[PDB]
Amino acid sequence: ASQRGSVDGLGSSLPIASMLPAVFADDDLALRFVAGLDDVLAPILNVLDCLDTYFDPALTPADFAQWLGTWVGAETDGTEAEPMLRAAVAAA
Amino acid sequence: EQFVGSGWSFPLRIGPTGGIALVSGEQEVEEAMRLILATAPGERPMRPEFGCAIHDLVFAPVNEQTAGRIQHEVYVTLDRWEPRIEVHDVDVTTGEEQNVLFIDVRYSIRGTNNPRSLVFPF
Amino acid sequence: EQFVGSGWSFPLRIGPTGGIALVSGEQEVEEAMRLILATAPGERPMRPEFGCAIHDLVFAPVNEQTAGRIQHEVYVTLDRWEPRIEVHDVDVTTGEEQNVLFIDVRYSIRGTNNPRSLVFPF
Amino acid sequence: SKGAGKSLVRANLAIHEPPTGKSTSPGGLIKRFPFEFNPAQLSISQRSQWKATPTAAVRKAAKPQFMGAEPREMTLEIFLDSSMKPGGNTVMKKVESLLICCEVTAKSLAAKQPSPPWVIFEWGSFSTARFNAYVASIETQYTLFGTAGVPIRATCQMGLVEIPGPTPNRVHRVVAGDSLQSLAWSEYGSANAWRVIAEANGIDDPSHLPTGTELILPATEEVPH
Amino acid sequence: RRFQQFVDDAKRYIQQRAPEWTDHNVSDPGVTLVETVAHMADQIVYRLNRVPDKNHLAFLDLVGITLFPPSAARTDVTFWLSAPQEDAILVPVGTEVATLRTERDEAVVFATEQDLRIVPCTMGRLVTQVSGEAVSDRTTDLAESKDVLCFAEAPNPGDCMLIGLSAAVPDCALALELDSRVDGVGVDPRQPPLVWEAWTEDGWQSCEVDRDGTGGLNRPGDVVLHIPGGHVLSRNGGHEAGWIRCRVTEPLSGQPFYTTSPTIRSAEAYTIGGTTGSIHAETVLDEPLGESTGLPGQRLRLEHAPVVAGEPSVLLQTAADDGWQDWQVVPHFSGSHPDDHHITVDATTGEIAFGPAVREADGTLRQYGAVPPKGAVIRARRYRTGGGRAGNVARGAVQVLRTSIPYVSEVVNREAALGGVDGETIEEAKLRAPITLRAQERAVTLRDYEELARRAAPETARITCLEGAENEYGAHAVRVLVVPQAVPDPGGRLRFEQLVPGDALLNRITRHLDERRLIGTRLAVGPP
Amino acid sequence: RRFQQFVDDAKRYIQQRAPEWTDHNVSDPGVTLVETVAHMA
Amino acid sequence: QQFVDDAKRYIQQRAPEWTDHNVSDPGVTLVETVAHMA
Structure with missing residues (x-):
C-alpha cells in the first residue's frame, strides 16, 4: 500500500464557499459545514496544481523515482538508499 | 391540493436532536421563494437563467414604467422556477418617501385557496 | 468582439528592424477603408466593382439630391467590400462656402461599439 | 395604495435578439424604441379552433x-412627427x-438559427398587452414630406403575435362531508373508479376514513383513457 | 407467488335486473334502490382480497417472533436555585421538566424518576495536610483566625486539603468559597489539574469542576461542585460530616505546578442545586376518542407517541348510567369472560383493540371480552407517552420546568441524552422473518460447530471441531481447538503464553455451545 | 496514438439524486445546492 | 504509481472538527455527506 490519505490543514484553489451564490454567503452553518467538505477534497487539487514536479526525478516522491527509472532504463536494482537513486534516474 | 413535499431550510441549523432540520408545508414553499428572489441571474453559472433580474432595474426613475417592468419580471420567474405555487398579484408601493420600491407578492399553493404574502423576515 | 486580423499598411514603412511592418487592431480598419474609398471603380481591371464611385457625382449641383445619392454610394460600397465594419451614418456638409462637399463617415467594428470617424490624414 | 401614482409614462417598444440555444427567454437588448405618441387605440384579439362535423x-x-388554440394578436398604431423642425431626420x-424587426439578425444567422428579433410592448402597468x-x-x-426629401409625418401600423413561453422547468x-366514492368523482370523474384511491393510500377498510387524514390521489397514469 | 384474485366490479352486481317476474318495469328513478344500495358488497369484496397489515403481526406470534419494543432516553437533569435556606422534599417524584417549544413541534417532555432534596450544607474542620502528614486528630487549624497552610506551600502527589460537609447530600450541587492570600507568581486556574474527591463509603470517588476560581486561587474563589453520591468523611476529630479532598496529581509537562501555594483565609459552603436523571416520559390527561359502535372487535387509535411500559397506562372510561365505568388493561386476551371488562393495548403504537367475536360448530357468538353499548363515550383518562427515538435531545437543550411547582428557577442538563431506539414497524419485521427464522440454532454438523463458536466469540482466529476418535472415552463427543489472536512482536518471535487462551474466553464459548448442543455430545475447548 | 479518454460530462453528475432516503422530496428551489455547487468535479 | 488511496467508504466526516452536528447516521445530511463523485 501507499497510505495516500487526506491531509489535515491544507487549503484549496477552488473553495466550495467561493462558488456559492450571493445571499447564501450570509449563513453561519452553511459556510462552516460546506467548508468541511473542502477537507476531504483538498489534496486532489494539490496534485493537479503541481503535476510537473510529480515527474521531475530530483523532487518527485520515492515511489515514482523507481517507476521513472523504468522509463529510461536506469538499472535501479540493488539500491536501498533513496539519495543514491535520485542521481541515477536523472543522469541515466 | 397540490403536494408540497419537504426539504432543507435556507438558514440551516442543527435542530432538536442533531443533524439538520427538515421543514415542510406552507413554510417550505415560503423558503423556496426566498432563494429564488435573492439570487441575481448569475452566481450559479451551471444554471444561468435561474434568479431574478431585479438588480438590472435598480436606479431607474420612480415611475409606473419601472413598476410596470417589475410586475412582468417577478411574474415570469415565479412561474418558471417554482411551479407548486399560484401567484395572486404583485404590489409595488413607494415606501418612506419617493425613494425605495416595495414589492409585495400575494400567493397561494395551488388548489388550497390560502392567500399569503412573502415577507422576507431578514 | 469581432476579429480584425492583421496585414500590411497602405503607406508601408520598413519598420524598426527591417522587412515591412504589420498593423492590426482598430488602426488597421482605417487602411482598408482608405484603400476602398480612394480608388475609383475600374482602376483594377481584374476586380471592376471594387472601389467606391464617388467621382460619378462630381460637378453636380450642391443639392441634398446630390448628397442624397452620395449617401447611397458609400453605404453599399462600404458594406459590400468591408464586412467587418458596421457603418453609423454618413454626414455630407459643404463647409467653406458652397463649393466643396465633405463626407464624414461614422463607424464601429461590430460588437466593440466604439464610435469612430474616418479622417483620411493626408 | 399606488406606486408612482401620479406620473405620466411614455410607452416604449423593446427589441430583443432571438434566443440561440435551448432557451426560450429572449436574449440581450439590442435597441429600445421610445414612442413619440402613445397609441390612441390598441386592439387585442384571440381565436380558438373547434372542428365540428354535423353528421352521425x-x-x-x-x-x-x-383542435387547438390560436395565438394572441395586437394591432398598434405608431405615430411620429418632426413638423416643428422641418428638414430634420x-x-x-x-x-x-x-x-429591423422584419429581417433576420446577423448574430443569429451566424449560429444557424435565422430568426428576426423578438419584441415586447412595455407600457406601465399594462400587463395584458406585454408579452414576448x-x-x-x-x-x-408617409405624409407631410419636408423639403429636400426627408419625411416628417409617418404613420406605422404593427401586427404583433404572442410567442408561447412553455416548459416551466x-x-x-378528508373532510367530514367527504367520502371515498365522492372523492373519485371529484378528481377523476368516474364514480366507480374509487378502487385506485384506496390502492395507493393502502387503506383496507373504506368504512371509516378518519377525518383530517391526508390522502394521495395518483394521477390518471393508472387508468390511461 | 401464485395469488388468487377476488375482485368483481361494482357495476356487475347490478346486472341481475332479471325482469322475468312479470309486473316490474322500472328504471333508476324508483324505490328499487335496495337492489343498488346493496352495492356494499363491492365494498365488502374489496375487503376480501386485501390482507391487512395486522395479520402479519399475528403471523409473527404464530412462528415465535417477538416484535421489537421501543425504548426511551435517559439524561442528566440538573436544577438550580439561589435561596439555600433549609431542607425538605422539594422534588416530588415524576417532576416534569421539558425542552423549549418553538415553531416546529411540541417540545419533548422529560420526567424525573426519583425525588430530590436540597439543603444549604455547611462545613466542619479545615485542617493542615501535606504529603505524608496525616490529620493526627487535628480539627482547629482554621477554627478562629489565622490561616491553614495549603500543602505546606508545596503541591506533590499524595497531597490533600482537609474540609468538611455537614449534609453530604448524594445528589446536590455545592459551592465552596476559597479565600486565599496571594503569594508568589500568579497562575491560570486551569494550569494546575487538581483532582477533587469525596471519600465515598466505597472509597475515594472523583468530582467535576464548573467554576474558574478553583484550585488556582490567585483570587478568593468560589468552587462549585455537584455531589457524587452519599458519603461521609473519615471521622477523626470533632466533625462527622462529608468530605472534599483537593488532591494534587503529578506535575505534567504541559500542566505544571508551582511552589508556594496560597494560604486559605476564609471558606463557606452553600448549595445551589441538585442533579438527577430523567427518562423520556410524559403523562397526558383526558384524551377522548369517540363513541362506541356497540360491535365486537372495535379498534381505537391515540394520536400520540407509543405508550411507555409500566403500570397499566391506558385507562379507558366509558359512559354509563351509574357513571364512568373503569376498564383495566390486560395482556393478550386469552380466557376473558363476557362479564369481564378487558382491553388490549399495543405498546409500540396507538392501536387499541376490544373484545373479538368468533363463531364455530354449534353456531353461537362466543365472545371474549365485553363490548361497550352503543352511544357510550370512551375517553382515555390518563396514560404515559415518551418512548421513541425523538428523545436524543441535544446537550443543554432542556430549559423549562413544568408547572413551576417548587422554589426552583433554572433547570439545565449538562450531558446529552443517552438515546432511545424507535420501535420496529411491521414492514421492518417482514424483512427480519426470512433471516432470523433460520439462524441454525442446532449445531448438527461440523460446519455449524465451528461456525457457532465464531458467533459466540468473534475474537478468535482459527476454530475447528474434531470428534473424539474411536477407542476414546466421552461417548464419541467432540473436541474444539481455539486460537487467540496475538501480534508476534516486531522481533519476529511469539511467546508461548500469547498462545494459551484466557479462561473467560473459554467460559463464554463453552456456555453458549452448551445450550445449543445435541443430546449426546460433550465438548472441551483448548489449544491444540 | 492509443490514448485513454477521461471525460464524464457535468450533467450526468447531478443524475446522482438517489431519492431512496426518506424525507427528502425537493426540486430546483431547494437548499440542495451543495450537490450542484459540487459540480467542480 | 498510486496518486490516491481512498474509496467510496472513505468518508472523513470532519464537520465536527468545525461544527457541532452530532449524529453519525442522520436521516438526511449524511446523504449529502455521501459523495461518490470523489
Missing part, C-alpha cells in the same frame, strides 16, 4: 373537439430602427 348515424348535433431615422412577441407586418404611411385532507 343519427344526425343529431355532435360534440365538437378542441428624426422621423426617418426612428422608422429605420423600427424596420414577433412582428408580423409593418404597413407605413395531489394531496387531499
Whole structure:
C-alpha cells in the first residue's frame, strides 16, 4: 500500500464557499459545514496544481523515482538508499 | 391540493436532536421563494437563467414604467422556477418617501385557496 | 468582439528592424477603408466593382439630391467590400462656402461599439 | 395604495435578439424604441379552433373537439412627427430602427438559427398587452414630406403575435362531508373508479376514513383513457 | 407467488335486473334502490382480497417472533436555585421538566424518576495536610483566625486539603468559597489539574469542576461542585460530616505546578442545586376518542407517541348510567369472560383493540371480552407517552420546568441524552422473518460447530471441531481447538503464553455451545 | 496514438439524486445546492 | 504509481472538527455527506 490519505490543514484553489451564490454567503452553518467538505477534497487539487514536479526525478516522491527509472532504463536494482537513486534516474 | 413535499431550510441549523432540520408545508414553499428572489441571474453559472433580474432595474426613475417592468419580471420567474405555487398579484408601493420600491407578492399553493404574502423576515 | 486580423499598411514603412511592418487592431480598419474609398471603380481591371464611385457625382449641383445619392454610394460600397465594419451614418456638409462637399463617415467594428470617424490624414 | 401614482409614462417598444440555444427567454437588448405618441387605440384579439362535423348515424348535433388554440394578436398604431423642425431626420431615422424587426439578425444567422428579433410592448402597468412577441407586418404611411426629401409625418401600423413561453422547468385532507366514492368523482370523474384511491393510500377498510387524514390521489397514469 | 384474485366490479352486481317476474318495469328513478344500495358488497369484496397489515403481526406470534419494543432516553437533569435556606422534599417524584417549544413541534417532555432534596450544607474542620502528614486528630487549624497552610506551600502527589460537609447530600450541587492570600507568581486556574474527591463509603470517588476560581486561587474563589453520591468523611476529630479532598496529581509537562501555594483565609459552603436523571416520559390527561359502535372487535387509535411500559397506562372510561365505568388493561386476551371488562393495548403504537367475536360448530357468538353499548363515550383518562427515538435531545437543550411547582428557577442538563431506539414497524419485521427464522440454532454438523463458536466469540482466529476418535472415552463427543489472536512482536518471535487462551474466553464459548448442543455430545475447548 | 479518454460530462453528475432516503422530496428551489455547487468535479 | 488511496467508504466526516452536528447516521445530511463523485 501507499497510505495516500487526506491531509489535515491544507487549503484549496477552488473553495466550495467561493462558488456559492450571493445571499447564501450570509449563513453561519452553511459556510462552516460546506467548508468541511473542502477537507476531504483538498489534496486532489494539490496534485493537479503541481503535476510537473510529480515527474521531475530530483523532487518527485520515492515511489515514482523507481517507476521513472523504468522509463529510461536506469538499472535501479540493488539500491536501498533513496539519495543514491535520485542521481541515477536523472543522469541515466 | 397540490403536494408540497419537504426539504432543507435556507438558514440551516442543527435542530432538536442533531443533524439538520427538515421543514415542510406552507413554510417550505415560503423558503423556496426566498432563494429564488435573492439570487441575481448569475452566481450559479451551471444554471444561468435561474434568479431574478431585479438588480438590472435598480436606479431607474420612480415611475409606473419601472413598476410596470417589475410586475412582468417577478411574474415570469415565479412561474418558471417554482411551479407548486399560484401567484395572486404583485404590489409595488413607494415606501418612506419617493425613494425605495416595495414589492409585495400575494400567493397561494395551488388548489388550497390560502392567500399569503412573502415577507422576507431578514 | 469581432476579429480584425492583421496585414500590411497602405503607406508601408520598413519598420524598426527591417522587412515591412504589420498593423492590426482598430488602426488597421482605417487602411482598408482608405484603400476602398480612394480608388475609383475600374482602376483594377481584374476586380471592376471594387472601389467606391464617388467621382460619378462630381460637378453636380450642391443639392441634398446630390448628397442624397452620395449617401447611397458609400453605404453599399462600404458594406459590400468591408464586412467587418458596421457603418453609423454618413454626414455630407459643404463647409467653406458652397463649393466643396465633405463626407464624414461614422463607424464601429461590430460588437466593440466604439464610435469612430474616418479622417483620411493626408 | 399606488406606486408612482401620479406620473405620466411614455410607452416604449423593446427589441430583443432571438434566443440561440435551448432557451426560450429572449436574449440581450439590442435597441429600445421610445414612442413619440402613445397609441390612441390598441386592439387585442384571440381565436380558438373547434372542428365540428354535423353528421352521425343519427344526425343529431355532435360534440365538437378542441383542435387547438390560436395565438394572441395586437394591432398598434405608431405615430411620429418632426413638423416643428422641418428638414430634420428624426422621423426617418426612428422608422429605420423600427424596420429591423422584419429581417433576420446577423448574430443569429451566424449560429444557424435565422430568426428576426423578438419584441415586447412595455407600457406601465399594462400587463395584458406585454408579452414576448414577433412582428408580423409593418404597413407605413408617409405624409407631410419636408423639403429636400426627408419625411416628417409617418404613420406605422404593427401586427404583433404572442410567442408561447412553455416548459416551466395531489394531496387531499378528508373532510367530514367527504367520502371515498365522492372523492373519485371529484378528481377523476368516474364514480366507480374509487378502487385506485384506496390502492395507493393502502387503506383496507373504506368504512371509516378518519377525518383530517391526508390522502394521495395518483394521477390518471393508472387508468390511461 | 401464485395469488388468487377476488375482485368483481361494482357495476356487475347490478346486472341481475332479471325482469322475468312479470309486473316490474322500472328504471333508476324508483324505490328499487335496495337492489343498488346493496352495492356494499363491492365494498365488502374489496375487503376480501386485501390482507391487512395486522395479520402479519399475528403471523409473527404464530412462528415465535417477538416484535421489537421501543425504548426511551435517559439524561442528566440538573436544577438550580439561589435561596439555600433549609431542607425538605422539594422534588416530588415524576417532576416534569421539558425542552423549549418553538415553531416546529411540541417540545419533548422529560420526567424525573426519583425525588430530590436540597439543603444549604455547611462545613466542619479545615485542617493542615501535606504529603505524608496525616490529620493526627487535628480539627482547629482554621477554627478562629489565622490561616491553614495549603500543602505546606508545596503541591506533590499524595497531597490533600482537609474540609468538611455537614449534609453530604448524594445528589446536590455545592459551592465552596476559597479565600486565599496571594503569594508568589500568579497562575491560570486551569494550569494546575487538581483532582477533587469525596471519600465515598466505597472509597475515594472523583468530582467535576464548573467554576474558574478553583484550585488556582490567585483570587478568593468560589468552587462549585455537584455531589457524587452519599458519603461521609473519615471521622477523626470533632466533625462527622462529608468530605472534599483537593488532591494534587503529578506535575505534567504541559500542566505544571508551582511552589508556594496560597494560604486559605476564609471558606463557606452553600448549595445551589441538585442533579438527577430523567427518562423520556410524559403523562397526558383526558384524551377522548369517540363513541362506541356497540360491535365486537372495535379498534381505537391515540394520536400520540407509543405508550411507555409500566403500570397499566391506558385507562379507558366509558359512559354509563351509574357513571364512568373503569376498564383495566390486560395482556393478550386469552380466557376473558363476557362479564369481564378487558382491553388490549399495543405498546409500540396507538392501536387499541376490544373484545373479538368468533363463531364455530354449534353456531353461537362466543365472545371474549365485553363490548361497550352503543352511544357510550370512551375517553382515555390518563396514560404515559415518551418512548421513541425523538428523545436524543441535544446537550443543554432542556430549559423549562413544568408547572413551576417548587422554589426552583433554572433547570439545565449538562450531558446529552443517552438515546432511545424507535420501535420496529411491521414492514421492518417482514424483512427480519426470512433471516432470523433460520439462524441454525442446532449445531448438527461440523460446519455449524465451528461456525457457532465464531458467533459466540468473534475474537478468535482459527476454530475447528474434531470428534473424539474411536477407542476414546466421552461417548464419541467432540473436541474444539481455539486460537487467540496475538501480534508476534516486531522481533519476529511469539511467546508461548500469547498462545494459551484466557479462561473467560473459554467460559463464554463453552456456555453458549452448551445450550445449543445435541443430546449426546460433550465438548472441551483448548489449544491444540 | 492509443490514448485513454477521461471525460464524464457535468450533467450526468447531478443524475446522482438517489431519492431512496426518506424525507427528502425537493426540486430546483431547494437548499440542495451543495450537490450542484459540487459540480467542480 | 498510486496518486490516491481512498474509496467510496472513505468518508472523513470532519464537520465536527468545525461544527457541532452530532449524529453519525442522520436521516438526511449524511446523504449529502455521501459523495461518490470523489
